[PDB]
Amino acid sequence: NLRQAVMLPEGEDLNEWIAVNTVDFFNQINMLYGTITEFCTEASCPVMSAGPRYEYHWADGTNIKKPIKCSAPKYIDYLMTWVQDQLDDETLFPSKIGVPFPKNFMSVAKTILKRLFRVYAHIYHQHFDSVMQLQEEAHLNTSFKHFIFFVQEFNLIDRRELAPLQELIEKL
């Protein structure tokens, strides 16, 4: 029961819960995209997109403030390295029992989740046939559904970001 599994457990700390699931989703998505890289190439995906109605340009707001128009593999590389960095950052994601979560942690996590969604969107829009080819649709669908149930639970991604898969989300 996913709706149940995403709720804030008995006397748990919100930040820790979100931190803990965010790490897991990154891993899920990394795995899933990892499986179809052979089919996501600079040739197939010249610009990063969620179908022709949505095109994404990479910026992290610090090192790169002016969005770069790039291919899907490149955009996702930018993205995955970027998320990794954050998760490895001890001021951001404390693994010790001494560092608290920064005052802005929620905003940090929301930003990671916002962008992780785009990998799902690109996969569903552009590579679902490959996903079926490799017989990983069940893995993809359950992962996405889990991801969405969690963000809906804590209102972590706003509707206009989710729009490229609104129809798919509605059928969850």
């Binding site: 022709p52 109605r53 949505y54 095109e55 994404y56 340009h57 990479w58 910026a59 403030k65 002016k66 969005p67 970001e161």
Partner: peptide, 8 residues
């Protein structure tokens, strides 16, 4: 700057 460009 806007990271997402929408088209119709």
């Amino acid at each position: 700057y806007h990271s997402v460009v929408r088209y119709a």
